[PDB]
């Protein structure tokens, strides 16, 4: 089916306590594959996935080189922005940047992205047409003008539609076992006494990949959305994800409730029932 490639960059100023902290990570779908930490000893882009470990020095030196460059331009951005907002020198601020591409089930270019955020709010984004920019702040205007005049969109479009996509499918083939896999959820339920007239039924989904998953409860086949406690999908640490959905059942009513699980690793959706 569909796939994505995304690079995440975070730069945080450390007024007085040295250079700004810079952290970069790259993902293919929900699998991280590289990282760069400015505070680390190597000072190199490093592998975070088994399949990319075999790339070759040409690859690693090249990516370490381009990630260092990103580090530097963000270091300058922190200054630039401080000015744009007439902000103090003693303040710690944050710049974030994300860019990447999506390809459909046919593995052809489908969508590209390129966006910045300053101190947690949108700053500027490349529109889907990949030819125009979306600026919020009045400050963002200055940047928008700069990029239109220097023709930044054109350069990113070419990269997002070509280079980005070619490497995505290269990784897909090279990391096929990891990236083109699917781990169906291992499900189970728990029953715990809340009181003398109520019980909590928690429906579990574990060890699944990718992260996308639909986990709901129904009472006589009817939506229980507003009466369901759903936790955020979390990482297990080994590359798979976990999630649960709980409902409070009035004693003697377990038979009315069904848990439904939808995940692409399942040959067909599940309907679990405490019984």
């Amino acid at each position: 089916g569909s796939h994505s490639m995304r690079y995440f960059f975070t730069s945080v100023s450390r007024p007085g306590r040295g250079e700004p902290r810079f952290i970069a990570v790259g993902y293919v779908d929900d699998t991280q594959f590289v990282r760069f930490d400015s505070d680390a000893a190597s000072q190199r882009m490093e592998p975070r996935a088994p399949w990319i470990e075999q790339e070759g020095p040409e690859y690693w030196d090249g990516e370490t080189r381009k990630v260092k460059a990103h580090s530097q331009t963000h270091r300058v951005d922190l200054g630039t922005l401080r000015g744009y907002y007439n902000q103090s020198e003693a303040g710690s601020h944050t710049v974030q940047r994300m860019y990447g591409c999506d390809v459909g089930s046919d593995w052809r270019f489908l969508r590209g992205y390129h966006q910045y955020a300053y101190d947690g709010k949108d700053y500027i984004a490349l529109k889907e047409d990949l030819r125009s920019w979306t600026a919020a702040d009045m400050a963002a205007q200055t940047t928008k003008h700069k990029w239109e005049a220097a023709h930044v969109a054109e350069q990113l479009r070419a990269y997002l539609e070509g280079t980005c996509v070619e490497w995505l499918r290269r990784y897909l083939e090279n990391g096929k076992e990891t990236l083109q896999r699917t781990d169906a959820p291992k499900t189970h339920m728990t029953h715990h006494a809340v009181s003398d007239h109520e019980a909590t039924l928690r429906c579990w989904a574990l060890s699944f990949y990718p992260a996308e998953i639909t986990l709901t409860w129904q009472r006589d086949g009817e939506d229980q959305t507003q009466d369901t406690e759903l936790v955020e999908t979390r990482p297990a640490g080994d590359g798979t994800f976990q999630k649960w959905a709980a409902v409070v059942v009035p004693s003697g009513q377990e038979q009315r409730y069904t848990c439904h699980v939808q995940h692409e690793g399942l040959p067909k959706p599940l309907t679990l029932r405490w019984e």
């Binding site: 690079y7 790259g26 990516e63 381009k66 990630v67 460059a69 990103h70 331009t73 300058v76 951005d77 630039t80 922005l81 860019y99 910045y116 700053y123 500027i124 940047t143 700069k146 990029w147 930044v152 350069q155 990113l156 990269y159």
Partner: peptide, 8 residues
């Protein structure tokens, strides 16, 4: 990784 410099 994009290989060209970009400054806000």
């Amino acid at each position: 990784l994009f290989g060209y410099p970009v400054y806000v």
